[PDB]
């Protein structure tokens, strides 16, 4: 008998990676991309 009080109404989109709180998805979904390791033209040219 634990059935009653229930609903997903509280959302927090956390980060893996960083684990960085946010407000909104798309703003997370694209943040997540800044976790991707080989990035040409960064450090040097070659
Ligand atoms: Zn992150």
């Not at 008998?1 to 798309?26: D, L, M, R």
């Amino acid at each position: 008998g634990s059935s009653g009080s229930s609903g997903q109404k509280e959302k927090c989109f956390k980060c893996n990676k960083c684990e960085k709180t946010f407000s909104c998805s798309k703003y997370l979904t694209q943040h997540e991309r800044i976790h991707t390791r080989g990035v040409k033209s960064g450090p040097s040219s070659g």
